[PDB]
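pasting input
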Amino acid sequence: ERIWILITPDKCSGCRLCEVTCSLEHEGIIWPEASRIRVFELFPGINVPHTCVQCPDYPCVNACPTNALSVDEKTGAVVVNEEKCITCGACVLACPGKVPRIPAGKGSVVICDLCGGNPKCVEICHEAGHDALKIVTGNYRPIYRTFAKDPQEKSLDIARKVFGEDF
Amino acid sequence: ERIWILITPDKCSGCRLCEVTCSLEHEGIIWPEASRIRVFELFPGINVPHTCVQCPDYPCVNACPTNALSVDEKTGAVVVNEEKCITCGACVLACPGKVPRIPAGKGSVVICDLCGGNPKCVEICHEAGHDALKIVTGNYRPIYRTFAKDPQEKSLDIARKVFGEDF
Amino acid sequence: MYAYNGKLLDVDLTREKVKEVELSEDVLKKFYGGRGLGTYILWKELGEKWEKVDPLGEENLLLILTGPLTGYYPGMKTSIVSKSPESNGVVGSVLSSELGLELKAAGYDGIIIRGKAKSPVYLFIHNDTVEIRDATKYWGMGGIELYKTLLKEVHEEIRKKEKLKGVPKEPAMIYIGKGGENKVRFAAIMTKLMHAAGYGGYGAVMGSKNLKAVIAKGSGPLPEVYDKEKMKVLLREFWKELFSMTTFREWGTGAGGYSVGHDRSSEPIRNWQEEYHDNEEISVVNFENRTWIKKYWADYGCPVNCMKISYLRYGPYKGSISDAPDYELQAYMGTNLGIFEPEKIVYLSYLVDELGLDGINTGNILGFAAELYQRGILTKEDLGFELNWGDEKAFAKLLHLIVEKEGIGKILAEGTYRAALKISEIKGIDVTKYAVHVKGIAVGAHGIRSELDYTKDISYAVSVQGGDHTSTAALPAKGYTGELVEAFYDSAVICNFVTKPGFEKIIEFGNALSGFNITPEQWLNEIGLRIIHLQRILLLLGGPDVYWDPRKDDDNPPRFYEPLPSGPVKGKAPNREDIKAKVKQYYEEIGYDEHGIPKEEVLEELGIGEAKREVKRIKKRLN
Amino acid sequence: MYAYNGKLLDVDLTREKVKEVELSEDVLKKFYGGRGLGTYILWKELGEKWEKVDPLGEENLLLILTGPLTGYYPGMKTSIVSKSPESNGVVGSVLSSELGLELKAAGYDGIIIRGKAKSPVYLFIHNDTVEIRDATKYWGMGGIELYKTLLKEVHEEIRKKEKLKGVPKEPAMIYIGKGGENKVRFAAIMTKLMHAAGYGGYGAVMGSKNLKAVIAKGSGPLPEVYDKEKMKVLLREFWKELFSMTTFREWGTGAGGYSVGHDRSSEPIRNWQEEYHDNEEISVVNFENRTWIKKYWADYGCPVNCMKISYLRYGPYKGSISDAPDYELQAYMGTNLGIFEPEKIVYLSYLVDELGLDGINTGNILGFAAELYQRGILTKEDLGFELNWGDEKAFAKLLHLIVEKEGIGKILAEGTYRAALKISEIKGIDVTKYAVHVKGIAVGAHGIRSELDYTKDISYAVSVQGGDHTSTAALPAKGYTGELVEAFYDSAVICNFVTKPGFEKIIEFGNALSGFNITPEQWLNEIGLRIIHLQRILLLLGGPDVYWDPRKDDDNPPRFYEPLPSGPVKGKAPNREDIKAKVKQYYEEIGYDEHGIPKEEVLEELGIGEAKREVKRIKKRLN
Ligand code: SF4
Ligand code: SF4
Ligand code: SF4
Ligand code: SF4
Ligand code: SF4
Ligand code: SF4
Ligand code: SF4
Ligand code: SF4
Ligand code: SF4
Ligand code: SF4
Ligand SMILES: [Cl-]
Ligand SMILES: [Cl-]
Ligand SMILES: [Cl-]
Ligand SMILES: [Mg+2]
Ligand SMILES: [Mg+2]
Ligand SMILES: [Mg+2]
Ligand SMILES: [Mg+2]
């Protein structure tokens, strides 16, 4: 059965243990901008975790000119062949949520691969007691795709909700 | 090692599963006003769980004229001998948080006994994912006693925090 | 007894009298509770003169009821039953008030309210104390102010009196807003700002009795249960299943505003002129980030916590407060009006909540008026202002006119069905073709044309609750979706959203509580069937102002036969001759005759033979 | 290089030039990072002319540093080091800015800032790009406006440049408020509204250079680590231990405002006139229910999340934002001023945060002034208004005067020590008896009289950071409390609150990162000891305006020998003769001669024999 990461920004503490865990898992080093989940804090205390939602029409996969991106048949996650990637940015532009990220000196995009079915970001978030990330099990629902949006938009929405006309 | 229930009212959903669990455990029936943890919702959406804090000077124990109340030596919970209780209200009045409660037709006060050292309210709140209740395991700290406060006071503080001058 | 108290309060507002009446085991085994028990009381006390009972007149009964599962099964619902100002039938409505829990803990299973107080009153119940009290200071208050004044004051009163017993929890309260006070026919009964007994117009019934609110507090235990150990095992089982509904606990119905239109093409858009949209502004992600200040809110004993609280701190509508909002409000106070942005939807939801108006039948009449304006039938001078799609300010002005019964609001306050008749007569134009109702009750926000939603063909057409999407009919008529099973939940009385364990398990739980031995076959062939038949009979008796004829009124609004204009199943709509065939089959399967009138033989087998006297009066009117 | 980049940025604001300078393995093995590395740079460049270096003049250096554990160990701290305008020594300060992390991911370990810009500038670091930019438009802004304008604008600039690489996370920013801009001697350097490089007056150093802010963004990996598998194992072990500190994660330091005074009798009350109170209004339960809008907030990679955000939506101080507030603010901007009410404390904490003033040395000078008003020494005419204990409006007025250096504010803007000297000269009265400082730095909110707190006898008296309660001395002078171990955390750079695994385990973690083999004994006997010895030497060389003499200034303020007036240890205070004994014993154990001047032989053994030239100048001044 497939999984999807449901995000509750107002429970995010900004601990960024999800970034430490993800980048250590996939890069073997601490590397905030290569984590496949990245937390945006554009105003202190308004923390917005951001990652792939596995759009069923995969705009990123279909935009790639070198076929470096494919879809894992088991998980539905995007899979990056780093050696075919020419860091052209087409997938970055195609993504409704601007999720693909090319960090300095990697020479490839990075995109969440759902840790092959057992997200380590969710586990550490739950272990720390925040539960800003939670797994939903079951078939994909089209509304999932509407969560791919620009993190600056989410940040500004939340700031206005918390602070009102004083923001 | 002693335990103490640390409460976070803003994480309380009002599910009142703690009341169902506690009253079923101690009365064998569902009885909201005989639960030893009671949730106050004086304005919709502002939920305040309320229970004993095990004051080190036990005002309730020391006010009882019939010595129906004692202190468990292992936990440091209040223990009620229901047979000696004459439902006089002295413990109700002595308690800084107005915690002791005499429900209709019980014939005795009820006060949290910490479930003998394994609170069932904490367990269900944690299982439900709310975590408005959590156990702290060290030695007693004097500040714990300052949490024994009138629930109407806490309720109004929170409503003013959330809704501001428009409340 | 087990699981019930065996008592109802009987409250006469005309004579200012209160008494307790007995609730016998035989009645309980035959009608169970809530919707079923209320339908019986209404038929027994009024069925012989039903067509002369004005639902807004002092002879109506307002019933506040529970059932054996209320207080033990997860979640919390109270039942409200009366003669409906909308359909002139009966609606078994429910709202997540703890009133039912507080009543049972005080020694009662429910309240029968008769007559009409000389001046505004409220009803106060505190264990053995029952009092009719002056409410003229509170008449005109919405929910927020009512919680901060009346409810807080009653709590303080009780706290001071019970001082030597400790601090009691808050009392439970149901109430009306200005819509109910002015007898708008689709006014609702409210609790906790955002919860409603939504369908049926019962806020107008309650306001017609000069009754502002009912407040109840109990501190005793619930009735004894027959099998405690079984009950505990089942409860643990149910909690564990209900905890696992991840997306429903996180989002409630809040994803509906996007999902139903985009995925199922069954969402009302501009008075049902379309049913599909592609607009992501209304997605739950934006309600959450822009408006939600409480993501997990729950009623008594509920492991689902489907509720949310939305609140605006910014913009012209700051101060507005609502829930997710519920999907039906996202549709009927939103997409139905051409409005997709969360801020505006939270504003309009807040207004109908504060005014005590059912969001479904309110949004229906607003979209109706806006289509009449679109088509030139209602002019700017008729309204006093322009009513364009998407203009939340104009819809708010219209709400004001309706509640004050001012100008065109006096006509619109009667509800879509009656207002369509009146405007047709006034304009010499048939506007009933734009009125989207069945049996005088607006169709809930789930269309039948796409057949991608749970509603199809005869869902509304034959239901004893008309356009009520929460109690639709199914084929086969028995069988676990459909009227009979919903009659059980509305009688049990439990929350639909907590029924994951399934019909058979929940019936088993109820036997563990009550000592009964009801089977699912017995519910579907006898107990639920007799509830449906009595409701069918009362609905067909109708009156005094509106009567139904099953040969034309067991049917869908004509808009539901127009092909869908847009979306992935563009062109789809059912065929009226197939609908006519399924209706005749439903009659057969449910025990009505070929004209849709309950068979006198079936009534006698159901133990309700006296109802032949009513079936006999339906037929002279019809022939 | 493992764990470091091996590079510092060198920024000359006078000439407007930027270069990279090498950081050698030899220097790093000798001084490690942060506080120790900055002390070495300051002595190397300025030690020969130290007593001529004005901390507010062009010649001072402002150093922004990291250490090898920065970016890998849990939590996040950047080091700030300079010649201090308070003590004229060095303070190893830290604040939980991700600036250090972003620097290391951009390829640098820190920044040497020299000179003075002709007009206000900010420093911009983005990977290889380093620019000095005009900051005239932002001069005068508090932190809230600065995040909403400069930082948002720099993020948008980065986003548009990097468009084909995705959206970068936000840059990190350290900044000053109007207090630093106006060279108030206890101004702080801020980050994220409510985090501070608190002790030392480094906000005035930054303002004296016309530097408004430093903004840094890096998108590369951290440096390679020597033993990555050991690092990951230790990391999991550290997380699991740190997650278990239940009450510190739930409350942070917010329980201090009540607990330190009530339980330990060591909290300043009305300029330390009392140290005990019983007042429950200041309990964390009230801060949480009345003010906390975010209960769990955390810096990069932190499993502790000790931070909270308080915010007022009501009352005259609506709009005020702060943290729990930190215990030192609850004390020094609260009980020290006779204020116990959460709402008032959040207001005054917000003011010092927005103004960029250290809350400890600010609260100290405000309570000093209020005691002088109590005693008739500062009149109403001297101040311009009455300054009563408890009057938060009067303290806010005094803050305004201090920042604008207007009236009495010009004197008070110089800090408690210098102000007391000036007022003593003006009034012909010794007010230094009321000034609670050591070596020119206000004593942090932990007293020594009760001996119930961790501070005792010589904690402040001999420390190279004076009244700084985050770097107190211990007996034995080595051993795991005390200056040498704190010197490690301030050089590692890591947060004190994440050090549960303990000194030895954290040293071992740093070896796994760096490939060094430092032992606890090497730290205590060589590396930390040489850092402390250089700090002692720079502090003893002193000002240009203020000099210390250890024969009188290695001592507690006289108020700390007054018996406690109230509470469970009423009557208690240490004896000056015992203090003198312990001071002489501390000299012996740490390697100072009988007069408290580092022994020339110890300096040679420590590898800093060149500092004998400085010890020699200290001796002719003193002889
Ligand atoms: S771990 Fe959870 S709480 Fe911490 S940053 Fe990631 S998402 Fe937010
Ligand atoms: S979210 Fe962006 S990256 Fe993920 S699937 Fe959709 S397009 Fe690809
Ligand atoms: S960046 Fe790499 S992955 Fe993205 S499209 Fe270009 S080549 Fe394919
Ligand atoms: S699921 Fe795995 S890959 Fe995707 S973000 Fe979480 S940790 Fe990284
Ligand atoms: S269980 Fe937890 S969340 Fe539910 S009411 Fe009790 S305390 Fe609140
Ligand atoms: S809280 Fe009240 S009931 Fe509990 S110990 Fe203190 S006095 Fe007794
Ligand atoms: S009520 Fe019962 S317990 Fe409380 S004091 Fe009186 S007798 Fe003792
Ligand atoms: S600890 Fe046990 S007795 Fe105390 S409230 Fe929780 S469940 Fe009831
Ligand atoms: S499911 Fe939702 S509506 Fe039903 S009882 Fe639970 S919270 Fe209330
Ligand atoms: S402990 Fe507190 S201060 Fe230290 S890093 Fe973590 S959150 Fe920041
Ligand atoms: Cl703000
Ligand atoms: Cl409000
Ligand atoms: Cl970048
Ligand atoms: Mg609602
Ligand atoms: Mg219903
Ligand atoms: Mg702070
Ligand atoms: Mg420090």
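fyi The two ends of chain B are 43 Å apart (CA to CA).
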